[PDB]
Amino acid sequence: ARVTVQDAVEKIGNRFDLVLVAARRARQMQVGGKDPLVPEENDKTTVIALREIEEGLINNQILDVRERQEQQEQEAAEL
Amino acid sequence: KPLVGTGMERAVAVDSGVTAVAKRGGVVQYVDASRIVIKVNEDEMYPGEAGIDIYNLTKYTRSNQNTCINQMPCVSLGEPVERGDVLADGPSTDLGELALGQNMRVAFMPWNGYNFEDSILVSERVVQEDRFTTIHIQELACVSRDTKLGPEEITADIPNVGEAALSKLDESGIVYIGAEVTGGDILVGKVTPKDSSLRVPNGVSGTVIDVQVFTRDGVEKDKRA
Amino acid sequence: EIKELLKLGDLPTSGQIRLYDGRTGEQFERPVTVGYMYMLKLNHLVDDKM
Amino acid sequence: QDVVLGLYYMTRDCVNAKGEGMVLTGPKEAERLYRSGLASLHARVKVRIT
Amino acid sequence: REEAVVWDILDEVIREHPVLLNRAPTLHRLGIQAFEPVLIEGKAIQLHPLV
Amino acid sequence: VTEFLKPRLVDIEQVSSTHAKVTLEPLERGFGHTLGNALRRILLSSMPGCAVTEVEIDGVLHEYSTKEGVQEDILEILLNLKGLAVRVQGKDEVILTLNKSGIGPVTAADITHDGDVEIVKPQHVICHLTDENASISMRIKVQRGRGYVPASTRRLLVDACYSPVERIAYNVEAARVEQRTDLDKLVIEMETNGTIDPEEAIRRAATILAEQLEAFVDL
Amino acid sequence: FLKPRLVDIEQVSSTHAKVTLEPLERGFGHTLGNALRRILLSSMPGCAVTEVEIDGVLHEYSTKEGVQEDILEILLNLKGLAVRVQGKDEVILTLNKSGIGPVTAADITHDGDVEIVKPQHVICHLTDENASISMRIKVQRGRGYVPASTRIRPIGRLLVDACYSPVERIAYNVEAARVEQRTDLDKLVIEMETNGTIDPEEAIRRAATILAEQLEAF
């Protein structure tokens, strides 16, 4: 269920940073066990990443703050 | 034959040499799918060694571009043939007339874009009538090099391969003439001292029609040879 | 001469006849050219190139 | 090379048709007319569009 | 051996994995365009006439 | 030898009502266009329905005239009456009157009820009245018949859209069953005037075509 | 609404006929003509030669002593042969012939419930006093067109492309029917051209049954 990424580019207006952030998100989602924020409909991880981009509930800022928070909580979990 | 011809097609068909042009006129005494026999007219018979003449036709043999050359008879029994006229229809000819294709009922009109730029839209009836299907004889050679670590055999047993691919093979190692081989199957079983048997290439069907075996003077035989 | 030969049969002089759509089944709203052109088949087979 | 010809033959007018001076309330009835063959594709009508 | 299950699972990998259609003379930037594939029979690469 | 893959209505996923979209699959090779053409031409050319035939406006006498008090012209009045989607019962034809006055819009709900006469979308405007003395009235004669008839084939003549379907257009695209190579997937999109339901209009047309092929069927 | 019915079967020859349908309301003639033409051309069951087993021939691309035509040409001629086996859905025939002269299709020693519709269909020409052919022709019913290279054993079975299509050309005509008192009544004239192995009335009935079954989804 994907034809173009014009809305996603309208969200993050670089057309190149979009590819990097989507690649990072899909890499997080594929090899790891991170769950998608949008329910997938039997689609490849790239378009789930792009759909997360277009609804606006993700970006580079959200991803790196979430990763920093996850790193902080996992290093604090060692006690 | 082509409908809108030129009249030079006869010259090309009789000149190219595929058509068995009658050397001496006469009467067809015996026609057959592999030979044509003429009882020549008494005017053109020699005093001695006249007899009659026999034309040996060429059956399905490989051409230089893997197409099919095939001489077939175009005359009937007891048909008076003159001098310098065709007797055997060759490849892509028709009664001594160069017939390089087929006459098809065309219509110049756009059809839903299936003939968009230069494409051609063809009915199912065209292949139902069996018009453009073409024979393609191709050869596959499996040399047996007496390389290092020992000579290699043409034996009929191949390790680590079940009898499914060896069912078509005989007890000698060669495939039977007439087998309907499919892509990937074994034609001849060659194994080097320690599996390098020749196989049909991927995605090509066919039927084995001729196997010729050449052996060194010093290597005796196998039962198939 | 071509038109005379066409008139020898019962074919139109214009060379174009009327065909109906195979699927739709209605008239094509223009006469179209129909004839027998000698159509060769080249040995640039797709399975020799795929 | 096909779409341009189709559009140009469609978006064109000549002064005759099966129905010429009739009036339509929108594109849908124009399609209904053309599919049924009650009006040629090159009519000159006054439809009501939005 | 091209089993029936392989044909079923091919339709899974080919779903939204774009490929690069490319012509031999690539004069300009539009000589390489990415399309999603649609599996069909035959041995020919069907191409959208608009491009 | 007669085992044909029966089509099944997979989904009737539709836009807002009277704009249905039926996709039945899988048809055998080539029957998709056959069924699409049969259903399309039967729906668009022969369906029992009711539409207005002619109108008798008291204030005007010629199809190109002007009646004081309306802001439209006669042509747009006839064009509005063209789409008066009205469902009529057993009576073949009835006469409708549209007595109204006063400044404001003139919708279809301001018509004499006449009992069984029912309008499915009453918000259909007819004209706009912008004068105190603007008194409008018209005698509308809705008739029952089948198909579409031009006005130039048969007191102002109005094209009568008897068949409830407005836009019918099928579509055929390739579909595959588990192993077989080439089948069809008929996609039927239609939009009716509201006097009937498209999922019922399709089966009505199917019944009409089936009744033809019952005299020489093997049952 | 009126209903049509078969009124005449203009059997102008053995192969092609002219069936008439009457009456049809305005706009139904073209619908019925198109639907019946497409169903007849695409979906008429029939019978055709499928496999040939010549006794002394290994593969299609060989030659045989005595016959004037190659084995492939004989296969094409057998492909162009029509048959009307009555009861069984799959029959194996036998053809034996000797002596100089053409091998007519009438030489097939068919049993009771097998009928050859065009006996004069020549197969091959023997050109020898002592030369014979003995083939086991195979016939089965089918539908549409199934080539030899798309189905699914010995080295003697020659696979032959099959064309299960008794009809060859279906043209319909539409004109007004001279009813007692009514206008807009079409008279369909289906000028069909079979190859002799099917009754046109049965073909029309089968097409009607298939169309009705297709509509029976709703």
Curated annotation (Swiss-Prot), chain A:
GO terms for cellular component: DNA-directed RNA polymerase complex. Its EC number is 2.7.7.6. It comes from the Bacteria. It catalyses: RNA(n) + a ribonucleoside 5'-triphosphate = RNA(n+1) + diphosphate. GO terms for molecular function: DNA binding; DNA-directed RNA polymerase activity. Disulfide bonds: none annotated. Keywords: DNA-directed RNA polymerase, Nucleotidyltransferase, Transcription, Transferase. GO terms for biological process: DNA-templated transcription. Pfam families: RNA_pol_Rpb6. InterPro entries: DNA-dir_RNA_pol_omega, Pol_omega/Rpo6/RPB6, RPB6/omega-like_sf. It is an enzyme of class 2 (transferase). The RNAP catalytic core consists of 2 alpha, 1 beta, 1 beta' and 1 omega subunit. When a sigma factor is associated with the core the holoenzyme is formed, which can initiate transcription. Belongs to the RNA polymerase subunit omega family. Promotes RNA polymerase assembly. Latches the N- and C-terminal regions of the beta' subunit thereby facilitating its interaction with the beta and alpha subunits. This is DNA-directed RNA polymerase subunit omega.
Swiss-Prot record, chain B:
Belongs to the RNA polymerase beta chain family. DNA-dependent RNA polymerase catalyzes the transcription of DNA into RNA using the four ribonucleoside triphosphates as substrates. Signal peptide: none annotated. The RNAP catalytic core consists of 2 alpha, 1 beta, 1 beta' and 1 omega subunit. When a sigma factor is associated with the core the holoenzyme is formed, which can initiate transcription. The chain holds residues 697 to 945 of 1342 of the full protein. This is DNA-directed RNA polymerase subunit beta.
UniProtKB/Swiss-Prot annotation, chain G:
The keyword Transferase applies. Its EC number is 2.7.7.6. GO terms for biological process: DNA-templated transcription. Keywords: DNA-directed RNA polymerase, Nucleotidyltransferase, Transcription, Transferase. It comes from the Bacteria. Disulfide bonds: none annotated. Signal peptide: none annotated. One of its GO terms (cellular component) is DNA-directed RNA polymerase complex. Belongs to the RNA polymerase alpha chain family. Homodimer. The RNAP catalytic core consists of 2 alpha, 1 beta, 1 beta' and 1 omega subunit. When a sigma factor is associated with the core the holoenzyme is formed, which can initiate transcription. DNA-dependent RNA polymerase catalyzes the transcription of DNA into RNA using the four ribonucleoside triphosphates as substrates. The N-terminal domain is essential for RNAP assembly and basal transcription, whereas the C-terminal domain is involved in interaction with transcriptional regulators and with upstream promoter elements. This is DNA-directed RNA polymerase subunit alpha. It comes from Escherichia coli O157:H7. The gene is rpoA. The chain holds residues 8 to 231 of 329 of the full protein.
